[PDB]
Paper text:
The heme iron is axially coordinated by two zinc-bound histidine residues, forming a distinct two-fold symmetric zinc-histidine-iron-histidine-zinc site. Given the ubiquity of proteins containing homologous domains and connections to heme metabolism across eukaryotes and prokaryotes, we propose that [name] ([name]; formerly DUF2470) functions at the molecular level as a heme-dependent regulatory domain. We heterologously expressed and purified the recombinant protein encoded by the Synechocystis gene dri1 (formerly known as [name]) and tested the heme-binding ability of this small, soluble protein (96 amino acids, 10 kDa).
The native structure devoid of heme is a single monomeric chain with a fold comparable to other DUF2470 structures in fusion proteins and comprises of three histidine residues (His16, His21, and His79; one on each alpha helix) that form a tetrahedral coordination site for a zinc ion. Looking at the sequence conservation of these residues, we observe strict conservation of His16 and His21 (numeration based on the Synechocystis protein sequence) throughout different phyla, with the exception of GBP. Radius of gyration (Rg) values from Guinier analyses and molecular weight estimations confirm that Dri1 without heme remains monomeric and heme-bound Dri1 is dimeric. SdhB1 residues, namely Cys214, Tyr215, and Glu219, were computationally predicted to interact with Dri1 zinc-binding residues (His16, His21, His79, and Glu76).
Residue numbers in the entry:
A (entry chain BBB), B (entry chain DDD), C (entry chain AAA), D (entry chain CCC): 3 to 103
The structure:
Amino acid sequence: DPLTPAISDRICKHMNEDHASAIALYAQVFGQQTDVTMAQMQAIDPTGMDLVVESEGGSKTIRIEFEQPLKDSEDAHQVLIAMAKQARSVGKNSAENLYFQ
Amino acid sequence: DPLTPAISDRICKHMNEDHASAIALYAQVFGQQTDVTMAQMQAIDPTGMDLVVESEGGSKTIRIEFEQPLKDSEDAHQVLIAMAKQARSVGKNSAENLYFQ
Amino acid sequence: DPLTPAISDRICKHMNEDHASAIALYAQVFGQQTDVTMAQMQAIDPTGMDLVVESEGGSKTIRIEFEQPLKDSEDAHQVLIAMAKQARSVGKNSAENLYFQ
Amino acid sequence: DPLTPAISDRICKHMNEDHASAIALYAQVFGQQTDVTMAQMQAIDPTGMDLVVESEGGSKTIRIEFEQPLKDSEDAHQVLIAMAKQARSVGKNSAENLYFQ
Ligand SMILES: [Zn+2]
Ligand SMILES: [Zn+2]
Ligand SMILES: [Zn+2]
Ligand SMILES: [Zn+2]
């Protein structure tokens, strides 16, 4: 059930390998990062995730706190996939809301 | 001043008697050990240290490898103290790097 | 002793967090990639290491085979640190031995 | 058909009879198990499959979570075969671009 640091290590590796676009998208939307070229997960725990975010001339580490705490490892992948969808939707709505002085 | 079995014993005794919180921190942070009941140094050598950890009634030996070989015995205490500061400081974000879903 | 998949993951995670510039360097010199923005270790085993390299173009996986197989897991770090030195020291002699046609 | 425990029983049974080398391959690659004697599927459900893995020493149960939940309208025999291919394929990407120190 609970999220051992070894399962965090495995979740992060899986997401870095097979969902690098979802992580850039987390960093862009929840991370409010701009000209994000790439992003990797470094840790996940029940309250949030550590992302390393590369811009066109440097890198930083950000934290994204979850609205809901992560109960069980067995859910983490379905929740991260749902956050990637939610992030798609919120990025779409924001990009639409451009006004000019 | 090469590190010997004798010196190792004494370093371990000192850290166990006087720096018990530091060893738990090592096990928790570097060793990724969760719900840890006891942690003690068993041995130290130039390249690393061996820890015995009780998590759930059961015990294992974990090894933490140093980023750098210890030059000599006289460096051990100052490296272990610094390593306890280093461990207290993993996770920590600039603040400007904290966001929310 | 034996380099396990679990230890591979730990070495790669360490190298990606503490030595990212070293891995970019491996991709550059050992991996003859010239355009390299960044690079992550994906796996390490006794005979070599697997890298994801990002060029402006995009991403690719490469493998670098060690000259001598890793004797064990505890040798990995000192071998990687030495390879980073090997790698930084390729543009050497030529520096003082410039001649003109 | 949707995955009832009676359906799991027949899928596992066939895999365990006709595809034991695939089940061992799941456990070695996906499951990161080494020195595996053999391995059996004990159960499969929309989100993953439970394997029993035996090593020289003893046995252990692992779970492998599917990228996509199974939709029943998609077969599983064919899906597990795809997973068998994808497992042999892991590493092959990187080992195609082999370099030497
Ligand atoms: Zn002291
Ligand atoms: Zn290091
Ligand atoms: Zn079949
Ligand atoms: Zn996935």
